[PDB]
Amino acid sequence: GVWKYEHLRQFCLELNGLAVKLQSECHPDTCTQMTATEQWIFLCAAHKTPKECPAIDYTRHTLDGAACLLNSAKLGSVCRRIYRIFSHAYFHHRQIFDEYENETFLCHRFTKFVMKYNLMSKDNLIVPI
Amino acid sequence: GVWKYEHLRQFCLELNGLAVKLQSECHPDTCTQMTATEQWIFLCAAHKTPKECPAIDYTRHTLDGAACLLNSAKLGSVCRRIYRIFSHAYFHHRQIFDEYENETFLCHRFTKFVMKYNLMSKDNLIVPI
């Protein structure tokens, strides 16, 4: 169980690399909500009440919340929310996603990890490989 | 908006009538979980962490929580949870449900109300009429 919290932390570190690459074109005037592909809006959980943060905010606040939870079932929630950073990038920032993935395989590695430890429902794994 | 909280309270009162009828055969040795029809278990929200209460407990704790919230989006959550009392009775206590519904039309009245005020997704309205 201790390795579960541990390996997740390295993922959050590299996921910051993706978030920094994204903030060059994922802006709140155009990515006004956190979405991936269907008619779902995702509400940012880093607030007293879940909030319709723009995608860039959702990304930052969620990574921040995960980094905070880690240095201190809860794993499943963090993983589900972190994964949306990948799905938003894959569907709305495909070029940046592709560049970053070809260099790090981060989404691949993260997907194998949440499946290896049963941390997300397979139904939520909508990004290929 | 004030009528929304108000009409719900009368529903919770009559829903206590159903809960009292159910407690004659909905026991925790046989209804060990709160379920309706599919492979979903419903976790009781009247606890610090959602709990796998037996159906009778889920029913009582949820009605109790709704009565408390009322005399003091939140409406949607209460409605969704209260509705499971109907679906559990309909699928696992069909005779009691049928007797009570023929006398009160409570599920009918409740369903029309949550649709009238858009308080539950229609996807969750699995009990007929």
Binding site: G65 | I41, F42, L43
Partner: peptide, 11 residues
């Protein structure tokens, strides 16, 4: 962040 899951799908 914080979590409050009230529906679980049976294995």
């Amino acid at each position: 962040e914080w979590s409050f899951t009230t529906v679980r799908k049976k294995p």
